[PDB]
Design a binder for these strands. Sequence first.
RNA 1: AAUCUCUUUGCCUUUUGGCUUAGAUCAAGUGUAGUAUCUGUUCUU
RNA 2: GUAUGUCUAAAGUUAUGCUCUUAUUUACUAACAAAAUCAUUGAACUAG
Lengths: 323, 50, 35, 49
Amino acid sequence: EEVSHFYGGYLYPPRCYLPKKVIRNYPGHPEGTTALKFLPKTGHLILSGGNDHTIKIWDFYHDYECLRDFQGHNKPIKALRFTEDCQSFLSSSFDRSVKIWDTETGKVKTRLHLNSTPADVESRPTNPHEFIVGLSNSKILHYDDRVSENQGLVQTYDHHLSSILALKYFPDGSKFISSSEDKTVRIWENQINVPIKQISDTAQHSMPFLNVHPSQNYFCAQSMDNRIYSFSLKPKYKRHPKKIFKGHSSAGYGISLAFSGDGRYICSGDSKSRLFTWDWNTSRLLNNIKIPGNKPITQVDWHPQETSKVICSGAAGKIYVCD
Amino acid sequence: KLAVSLQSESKKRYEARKRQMQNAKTLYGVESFINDKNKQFNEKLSRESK
Amino acid sequence: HVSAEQILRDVYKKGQKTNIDILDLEELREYQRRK
Amino acid sequence: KEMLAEARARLLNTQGKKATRKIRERMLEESKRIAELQKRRELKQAGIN
RNA sequence: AAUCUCUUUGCCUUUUGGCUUAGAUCAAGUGUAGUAUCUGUUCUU
RNA sequence: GUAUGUCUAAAGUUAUGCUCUUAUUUACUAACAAAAUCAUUGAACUAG
């Protein structure tokens, strides 16, 4: 049985620079924060999840209070993803369930009882009804909540050989990228169980995280070799030989990476409680802010409109803002 | 004092060999090689011409 | 001019190409067992 | 120019199929090892030993 | 009397681990695809 | 086409200059492919 509490709709919206220091913090999740995302396009709200099995929305402006709390999972939160219209968000949990939450009323629009851990969930940028779930059993499930047949499971992608690590749609929603514990990255056409591209190499390590650069020309992948690689988003999608970002530590942690609103910079968490930031053109490391708590900072996100406000969190539980 | 003297002399010898290896890895003039072990082998062959 | 010596220097340069940490006793046991 | 490129490539190789597969297998074994520790660490942080 | 760095000498310290008929033969190929790769042009710098 | 190897992921809970867009060149790989001169005929067939 799900529950939700309100504390205030809030969805209506009320050249970048390097961040330099932590300006403020939020209570976050006591046992650790496992998911953190800014509200699309305007970033006036922060959605987060953690080990307390709860999900929380926090105001990024005014009094910085928590506005809505969602309690519908019996185990830690694994992934969180907003829809194109912000009207809903998806949540996955170690309880083997994916739930769609109405961002405003906190009512569950849909429930999926899975037979495997939903390692990552993603929603189609051009259709809020379509969502894909990456499973620990290596399959990727595509659902269309409008379809009642088989609970809306319209497609299954099964070429990966090991647990899915991350999922990321192309900005136009025609194709999506997937990464897996099988050490390969694959690009898929929507609803077609055929990978149009496969990215694999002898020295290429598994990539626990994927993101797309604001220009839509390249995508970046956090790799277990403590490096960030970049790949073209145009046909053949070759790896960019020079845009490699190095300096941080991430091996053994699913550390997220984000891009500045203007795409001038790239930033990422660090396993030693720090926030690194590199120049997108030369890939030179420009800063590494120390975050309180002395715990791995696995969650990092850059505000879509602010010039330099970044948010980060991790095993310490509290959420910190850098600027 | 004995344990410390043995540790310090082992350390000194180890670092001396480390520097010697960096020198060997940067000297040139030896016959063409395709990898580091091949370089060390060609250098060994060169020491026989003495 | 190309030379055999130049070719082999380019071969040498062509061929001449992660720090995990142990956080607790269980990882130390895994590491020691493997070693 | 293509002749020189092919020559440099064939002149570089030194190990047979088995040794080369052992190299790629050791790299894969390491990536599997790190994925195993990542999952174990997430579980540990959640109080699930 | 005790450091530091040079140079020589010594040490070679990641410094070729069997056998047979050189063990044997081959290295002319269409479409499409996959991977790597090449020149140029703008762009990055 | 094999030999053969690997995988199968909850629960049956053990107490705390340097790049990019893109049109080509070259190499390697593909039991993928019934390809028009030289009363209808390679045709289901080849493996350490």
